[PDB]
Amino acid sequence: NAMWESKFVKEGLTFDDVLLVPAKSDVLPREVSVKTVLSESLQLNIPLISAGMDTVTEADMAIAMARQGGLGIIHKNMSIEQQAEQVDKVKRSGGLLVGAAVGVTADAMTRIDALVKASVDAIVLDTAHGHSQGVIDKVKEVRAKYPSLNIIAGNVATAEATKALIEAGANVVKVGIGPGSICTTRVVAGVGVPQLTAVYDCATEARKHGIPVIADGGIKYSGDMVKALAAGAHVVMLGSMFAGVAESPGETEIYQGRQFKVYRGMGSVGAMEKLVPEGIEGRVPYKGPLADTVHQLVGGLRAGMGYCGAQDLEFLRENAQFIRMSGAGLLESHPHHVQITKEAPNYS
Amino acid sequence: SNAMWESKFVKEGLTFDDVLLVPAKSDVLPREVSVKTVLSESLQLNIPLISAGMDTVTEADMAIAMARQGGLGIIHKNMSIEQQAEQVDKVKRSGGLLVGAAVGVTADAMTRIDALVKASVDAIVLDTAHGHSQGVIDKVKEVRAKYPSLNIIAGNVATAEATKALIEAGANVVKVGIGPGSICTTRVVAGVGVPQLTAVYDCATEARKHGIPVIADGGIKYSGDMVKALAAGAHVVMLGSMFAGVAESPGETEIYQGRQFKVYRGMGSVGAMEKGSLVPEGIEGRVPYKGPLADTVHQLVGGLRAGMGYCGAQDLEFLRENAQFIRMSGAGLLESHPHHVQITKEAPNYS
Amino acid sequence: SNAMWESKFVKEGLTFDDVLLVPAKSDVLPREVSVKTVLSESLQLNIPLISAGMDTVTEADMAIAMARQGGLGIIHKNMSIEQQAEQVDKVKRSGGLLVGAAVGVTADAMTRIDALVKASVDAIVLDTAHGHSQGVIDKVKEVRAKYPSLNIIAGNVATAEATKALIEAGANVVKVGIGPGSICTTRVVAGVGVPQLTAVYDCATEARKHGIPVIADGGIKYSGDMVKALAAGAHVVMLGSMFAGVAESPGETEIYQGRQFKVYRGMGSVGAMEKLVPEGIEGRVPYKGPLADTVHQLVGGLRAGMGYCGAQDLEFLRENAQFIRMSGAGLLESHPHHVQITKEAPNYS
Amino acid sequence: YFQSNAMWESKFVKEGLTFDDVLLVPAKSDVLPREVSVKTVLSESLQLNIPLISAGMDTVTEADMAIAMARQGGLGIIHKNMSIEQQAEQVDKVKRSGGLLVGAAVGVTADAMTRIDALVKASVDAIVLDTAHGHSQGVIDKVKEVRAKYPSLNIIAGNVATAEATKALIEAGANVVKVGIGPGSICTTRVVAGVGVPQLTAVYDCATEARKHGIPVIADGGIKYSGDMVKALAAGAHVVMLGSMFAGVAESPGETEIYQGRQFKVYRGMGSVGAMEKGKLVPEGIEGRVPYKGPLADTVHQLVGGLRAGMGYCGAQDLEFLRENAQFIRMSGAGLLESHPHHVQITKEAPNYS
Ligand SMILES: C/C(=N\O)c1cccc(C(C)(C)NC(=O)Nc2ccc(Br)cc2)c1
Ligand SMILES: C/C(=N\O)c1cccc(C(C)(C)NC(=O)Nc2ccc(Br)cc2)c1
Ligand SMILES: C/C(=N\O)c1cccc(C(C)(C)NC(=O)Nc2ccc(Br)cc2)c1
Ligand SMILES: C/C(=N\O)c1cccc(C(C)(C)NC(=O)Nc2ccc(Br)cc2)c1
Ligand SMILES: O=c1[nH]cnc2c1ncn2[C@@H]1O[C@H](COP(=O)(O)O)[C@@H](O)[C@H]1O
Ligand SMILES: O=c1[nH]cnc2c1ncn2[C@@H]1O[C@H](COP(=O)(O)O)[C@@H](O)[C@H]1O
Ligand SMILES: O=c1[nH]cnc2c1ncn2[C@@H]1O[C@H](COP(=O)(O)O)[C@@H](O)[C@H]1O
Ligand SMILES: O=c1[nH]cnc2c1ncn2[C@@H]1O[C@H](COP(=O)(O)O)[C@@H](O)[C@H]1O
């Protein structure tokens, strides 16, 4: 009866539940290191990865990304020959880093070969439920065939799942079940773990095997990134904040005089039609080139590490302290009792 | 004698939107999982869904469509004894379909049950505002005495003491939910309730000890809430709202707010009481038209299969016994719905 | 010491919307329950409702209507002494009806009270912002010393210590509520309050020990809040907002965007007061028609409340009802949701 | 159990509270509001007759605000978004208007000493060493550098939200510590940088540290109503600093624009794009507008009125009593809802509400 009595024990935290407490600082925002190492083959100058979705990352996005010091993951919602071409395309553009997503399917190894042939630096085996036997067995197969290949497996939300995938041979683990802006998983399936807690629990375990974790989803301001990083993540992955960018796939859609870009979940009827969906379709404001959005994110990270007296991303993960707050805390934490006049480059 | 007074405020209650089901090790796919449940020795559903015995939800056409999706429908009692019998008769003739009927706690109650059973009703539901009553308990005994083979679903209850009381009265199944209803105002007019997830849980806890199943009834807005109700301990769930905008439900379509809509109302609302015949405990409204019951039920189950997939649950018994929740704040709720993106299309299972 | 410093944030407060009443075994139906209540040997009420002693809620006509429904009106003090004395007189010579009058702590308090006792007032209500004031305590004492029989309702307090203090000065009834009122801005303008549910309970905890009934005053937006207040230990509740749109309330009906409305305002707002800054605002509520249709919906909900708790009477309810606590999500589930509302119900707007 | 894993497993332990979370608990009172004392001592040479400082923002304080505040018994901080000689002129302008107290902000920069020199020459009564992060090595280094050169100068340093941080500035020479990272109405620090401590707790944790040394603290940011000020003082602050409640009064800088029939003034953060441009950047504030409130004397009379009310509610005769004794009760979001006007359509403006 022990499981029957534990159903409602666990409590979970999300980004907007917390604040990073300022700490003794000696280091200024321009001075801090934002470098990060996923592995031997995989080093990033900025801890950003653009999501593997048909409205977020194709060749042009992955390249603009890699030249910012970050990383692109080509979505798998295309042919095999096509993804391999675009992966090779990013590689011929200055010999820089590139990712490709593969689903746990029958044609998975066929896709992976063609991808390793095009010289991917990391494949991402993405699935709804990374804590699954099929997902384990696949990572085992792939680890067997390509012992040299960076393997990103997700998604997971628990310690148990983080361990299952590490042991199967995945060297980077991906955290997030249901925090995405376009995600309906928690609504339609009732399943999830608040992202902060899920980064924190998966990192605690992953820390032991010296394995890094990517916070995926739920990030809507630069300060969310800081929180996710400080809660244990090595790197964050973004969808919505990148979808509005000129280099992202999909052509600009006009709306109320303004310019927008389509942004849909890979699990939406829209993405799949090209069945019970776990995602929706919509649009985000046109934002400009990747370059200014990148600027605002990193600068936020830079100011947070400054506040936290963290010289590198390591010191931040291992030293940053949070403070929990109520919903009224959240109200104070955003602008309040003033009517906004101008748009800020980092706020709505 | 101070114990009762010092304890007025010790209990805490959780609901659907306070929690999330935690993903567990899975070796099963949504399609591989089984959603069948056994409610008793004569009542078995292929999907854990029951359409509410309300006058804007279930009549003969609703029950027939329900039974065909693998579920069940409860024919409401806002009609004549005779007419309700015909409706049960009608459902029965269309392929040996299952069907339930609602009966109130009155003096006409035995007379009404006599007809529904001669009509071959597969279960009766004694629905009341306060299922923890002598009036209810004595009526459940009275029926169980007369009809010892009859599937009795009794309610509504929100407590373990109450669930135990109706089981020892002879109830096969216990219906859980005081005040959780979408059209319901009980908690506002009378102050009384238990948050649904906790009510299902405390009750499932008692019903288990005796081998009795509970029915989660009310407060389900999306399919994820169904998984939560089942995972909390309910064998089966009862939906009003999610079903009222279906083609097979009674009533006609009307255009409102620029599209098609159906009338949805509470049985304790001023409207519904006029037809049937105290201070009202429900309101009258309308919900969007959704077309055939089939497409709705396909999303319902589809979400259920997805959840159980995430929970490594090959069947509903596993999900009841094993699923773990994690409590979350209001901010957790916001992360759990689509956010910070403008939606351009009604998704089949969202808004 | 350093005790006061470290305990600044220890306490926790709950309000009507924090909580639900748990359904209990019930032998009884709504129509069979008793809603009578006894404030004191002199004052007994057929229904647990007093109307607020404000200049836009209760004058003679309200007080008379209340009494006739089995409740009680408090005639506010925003008039002259001769005006309030004849207001009482009118209510009394209108069938031998119970009536109450407001008095504040000040110089001519005794003269007004003198005039009120002469006119046969049943209960004097010592309305002040801070019942736990030294000046309030001194005044309750003087009135008790002069009128050993007279019912004294003294308010307002939010703490067990204040309640204890009023009871010892001679108060027969204590009125509980700092800040929860619909028209009130005390909490906002002065940072000061206690959540009404915790307040009623805390004071009831102290008052029960001396057998003194408390009034849960302000904060009631629906029928169930009243069930909650009584179940938290109040003997009776006092309403202003729920009663302000009633036909027998002072104030003529005003037209605004076509719909009938009535003026409703705090007694500490600018208009009512005409040295200190306002602690109230001035507003408007829809017309509701006769008091009786409003009372019937109120008692109706109370009765359904009592039937769900298995309470034959209000003493059972006070001593036995159990609450359960919930988050914001639970309150969202507690109100009707995910449905367009078509028409108004007579008890939910 | 190790040294390495201490910080890791304390990450989520702390709890923060803010104004909207709590309520002051009424206590026995023998004192009427008009009898209480709102006088407050920040240091031997800096006594305020009312507990209110006009924040040092370009949309808030300049000579006219500073003058008007002082004549009410408060203080104004001339902002630094202007030249050195200009800022000293503003100071002299206030000092040559009846020897009114004035303070003036200075950041941590090479010219800081040049500026400080110029302000002291103008008889400034306090320098506010104002920075985004009070707990920075530079800020401590500056306080020390200034204290050394000006042993009698009043040095108000900010901004911090922790006892650890508050101890550093005190040990470095600040007479008065300013509290608040993120609570500001025009602030986005918490959104863009993720960082902050809820202001009520922040005021409390710092006051706890500071009172051991006999040092006052300033609640800076987050006050929307007079009641919030009272919570802030009762949480341990000697005095509050206000932006948005002062931003839209006659004496504040800015023209009177009008939209939809009503009067407004611009109010922007100092970390906003607008404020920076005056002297790509990654802002930590936003620009907007607030209602025109009219002459300062009205906002101030309402403010001090709320305070006296709450002190009477708390049986406080002076602010020291309130700091030492005031108790809070914690509430939820249904309580905050009950704590505002509800279920009535408000038909006119209370001078102190909305
Ligand atoms: C990213 C994502 N979910 O998080 C996604 C992507 C495409 C399709 C889908 C669909 C087909 C809608 N959902 C699933 O495949 N859900 C699912 C759920 C549980 C298990 Br086990 C296996 C799959 C989901
Ligand atoms: C509450 C409810 N369903 O949950 C319902 C349904 C129809 C009519 C009613 C009416 C008759 C308006 N209300 C009640 O019967 N309320 C009620 C409440 C407690 C007790 Br005991 C007996 C009756 C209620
Ligand atoms: C809050 C309230 N009734 O509940 C009320 C009523 C009338 C006037 C007032 C006024 C005079 C505006 N406020 C106060 O008198 N506040 C107050 C505060 C503390 C003390 Br001690 C004495 C009075 C308040
Ligand atoms: C936050 C604030 N005042 O409270 C303010 C004002 C002006 C400029 C700024 C800018 C330049 C945008 N931000 C910073 O200076 N941020 C910052 C953050 C951390 C550290 Br360490 C040093 C500086 C901030
Ligand atoms: O349709 C889907 N359903 C659920 N999750 C999705 C879907 N499509 C993408 N995601 C996840 O959502 C992430 C982006 O979340 P966002 O940055 O919060 O917009 C992606 O990286 C995926 O992990
Ligand atoms: O008017 C009434 N008052 C309170 N609850 C009601 C009333 N009518 C029906 N219900 C309950 O609400 C359930 C439907 O809830 P829904 O699925 O949220 O629409 C029904 O199955 C009944 O249990
Ligand atoms: O203006 C005032 N400021 C604060 N509270 C008031 C004021 N005037 C009346 N009250 C209280 O508010 C109660 C009515 O609150 P309501 O029933 O929620 O409308 C009255 O009975 C008084 O106790
Ligand atoms: O640009 C900004 N970003 C963050 N905080 C600011 C900024 N400008 C001023 N502040 C702070 O916010 C306070 C004013 O907050 P308010 O009274 O809530 O408007 C000031 O006294 C500063 O401490």
DSSP-assigned states of every residue in D155-207: EEEEEE-SHHHHHHHHHHT-SEEEE-SS--TTB-HHHHH-B---HHHHHHHHH
Q: What are phi and psi of B246, to 5 degrees?
A: -95, 150
Pick from A222, A226, A335: which is nearest to D187 by CB?
A335
Q: Which residue of A has its CA nearest to D16?
A: A325
* C290: nearest Cα among C97, C62, C126, C87: C62
Q: Which of D187, D202, D241, D247 is catalytic?
A: D187
Whether the Cβ atoms of residue B21 and residue B322 lie closer than 8 Å to each other: no
Q: State the fold for domain C1-349.
A: TIM Barrel (3.20.20)
* C300, two tokens: 């109706």
Is residue C216 within 6 Å of ligand 3 at its C-beta? no
Of C178, C183, C193, the CB nearest to D344: C183
A38, C94, C123 from C86: Cα distances, Å: 87, 12, 15
Cβ-contact B48, B301 below 8 angstroms: no
Radius of gyration of chain A (CA): 20
> Which two three-digit tokens encode residue A245?
């960018």
User: Beta-strand (E) ranges in chain A?
Assistant: 11-12, 18-20, 36-37, 43-44, 48-50, 71-74, 99-103, 122-126, 150-156, 172-175, 213-216, 235-238, 253-255, 258-264, 281-285, 322-325, 339-340
**Subunits in contact with chain C (3 or more CB pairs closer than 8 Å):** B, D
Resolution in A: 2.6
Give the end-to-end CA distance of chain A in Å, rounded to a whole number.
49
Identity (one letter) of the amino acid at A100? Answer: A
H or E element, residue B176: strand B173-176
The answer to whether B207 and B234 have CB atoms below 8 angstroms apart is no
CA pair distance C90, C97, nearest whole angstrom: 10
Give B298's contacts in chain A (Cβ within 8 Å).
Answer: 276
Residues 6+ apart with CB under 8 A from A251: none
Compute the distance between CA of residue D190 and CA of residue A22 in angstroms, rounded to an integer. 11
Say if residue B148 is exposed, middle or buried (CB neighbours under 10 Å; 0-12, 13-18, 19+).
exposed
Helix (H, G, I), strand (E, B) or coil at B218: coil
* Beta-ladder partners of B123: B100
B1-351 adopts what CATH topology? TIM Barrel (3.20.20)
| Any atom of ligand 6 within 6 Å of the Cβ of B239 | yes
Of all helices (H) and strands (E), which one includes residue C90? helix C81-92
Round to whole Å and give the CA distance between C64 and D263: 47
- Look at the alpha carbons of C321, C322, C326, C332 in this order and tell me if their dihedral is positive or negative: negative
Q: Is C103 helix (H, G, I), strand (E, B) or coil?
A: strand
Catalytic residues of A: 183
Residues in chain C with CB shorter than 8 Å from the CB of D347 are 263, 282-284
Contact A316, A310 (CB under 8 A): yes
Encoding tokens for residue C36?
């009578």
B347 with A184: Cβ contact below 8 A: yes
To test the contact with chain C by mutation, choose from B12, B189, B257 the residue with the greatest count of C C-beta atoms within 10 A, namely B189
The shares of helix, strand and coil residues in chain B, as percent rounded to the nearest 5, are: 35, 20, 40
Per DSSP, which regions of A164-279 are E strands?
Answer: 172-175, 213-216, 235-238, 253-255, 258-264
Q: Which residues contact D9 (CB under 8 A, 6 or more apart)?
A: none
| Residue D57 φ then ψ, to 5° | -115, 150
Select the residue from D109, D282, D340, D353 to test the A interface by mutation, using most A Cβ atoms within 10 A.
D282
- Quote the CA–CA distance of C56 and C268 in Å, as a whole number: 12
Annotated binding site of D: 130-132, 159, 180-182, 184-185, 187, 220-222, 243-244, 267-271, 284, 338-340
CA atoms within 13 A on the CB side of B274: 6
State the Cα–Cα distance between residues B122 and B116, nearest whole angstrom: 9
The number of beta carbons lying within 10 Å of the beta carbon of residue A117 is 11
Which residues make Cβ contacts (< 8 Å) with residue C199, sequence separation at least 6? C13, C158, C159, C176, C177, C178, C180
The verdict on a CB contact (< 8 Å) between C14 and B9 is yes
Smallest CA separation from ligand 3 atom 6, residue: C268
Q: Which of D156, D151, D160 is nearest to D132 (CA)?
A: D160
Chain A CB contacts of D285 under 8 Å are 344
Nearest 5°: CA angle at C302, between C298 and C305?
145
Q: Which amino acid is at B178?
A: I
**Experimental approach taken:** X-ray
Please give the span between the terminal C-alpha atoms of chain C, in angstroms, as a whole number.
52
Chain C residues near residue B54 by CB distance under 8 angstroms: none
D201-221: b or e for each residue (b if 16 or more CB lie within 10 Å)? bbbbbbbbbbbeeebbbbbbb
Contacts of B25 in chain A (CB under 8 A): 131-133, 160-161, 164
8 Å CB contact between B351 and A279: no
Which residue's entry shows tokens 């708390």? D314
The residue whose C-alpha atom lies closest to atom 10 belonging to ligand 4 is D271
Distance CA B79, CA B102 (A): 11
CA distance linking residue A83 with residue A99, whole number of Å: 10
Token pair 């148990």 in the structure block, residue:
A160
Out of C227, C319, C328, the one facing B4 most closely (by C-beta) is C319
Query: In whole angstroms, what is the distance from residue D235 CA to residue D22 CA?
Result: 11
Instruction: Please say whether the beta carbons of A321 and A226 come within 8 A.
Output: no
* Structural tokens at position D30: 């023998």
C84, C101 Cβ separation under 8 angstroms: yes
For residue C172, whether the previous peptide bond is cis, meaning omega lies within 30 degrees of 0, is no
Give the single-character DSSP code of B16.
G
Chains with 3+ CB–CB pairs under 8 A to D are: A, C
Report DSSP state, residue A252: P
Q: Which helix (H) or strand (E) holds B335?
A: helix B330-336
A1-348: CATH architecture: Alpha-Beta Barrel (3.20)
How remote is the C-alpha of D25 from its chain's centroid? 24
> Amino acid identity of D316?
A
Q: Which amino acid makes up residue C166? A: L
For residue B131, give the DSSP letter. Answer: S
Nearest residue by C-alpha to atom 14 in ligand 1: A128
Sign of the alpha-carbon dihedral angle for B169, B135, C19, C317: negative
Please report the sign of the dihedral spanned by the C-alpha atoms of residue C39, residue C44, residue C48, residue C53. Answer: negative
- Point out which residues pair with A100 in neighbouring strands: A74, A123
Tokens at residue B67, please? 């039974």
B252 annotated ligand binder: no
CA of C212 to the centre of ligand 3 (A): 25
DSSP D347: -
Residues facing C102 on adjacent strands: C125
Q: What number does CATH give the domain D1-354?
A: 3.20.20.70
Alpha carbons A196 and A215: distance in angstroms, whole number:
9
Give the residue, by CA position, lying nearest to ligand 4 atom 18: A303
Counting as contact any 3 or more CB pairs under 8 A, the partners of A are: B, D
| Helix A133-145 and helix A108-117, axial crossing angle in degrees, nearest 10 | 40
Instruction: Name the closest residue on chain C to residue B163, using Cα atoms.
Output: C25
Q: In whole angstroms, what is the distance from residue A242 CA to residue A57 CA? A: 9
- Answer yes or no: are the C-beta atoms of D191 and A227 closer than 8 Å: no
Nearest CA-CA partner of B74 in B91, A59, B82: B91
Q: SS3 helix, strand, coil % of chain D, rounded to 5?
A: 35, 20, 45
Nearest to B6 by CA among C19, C208, C8, C331: C208
- Beta-carbon contacts of residue D312 (< 8 Å; ≥ 6 apart): C130, D29, D31, D32, D33, D36
CB contact under 8 A, B26 and A278: no
- Whole-angstrom distance between the N-terminal and C-terminal Cα of chain D? 53
Phi, psi at residue A288, to the nearest 5°? 110, -155
Backbone angles phi, psi at D60, to 5 degrees: -120, -65
Ligand nearest to the CA of B217: 6
Please report which helix (H) or strand (E) contains residue D301, including its range: helix D296-313
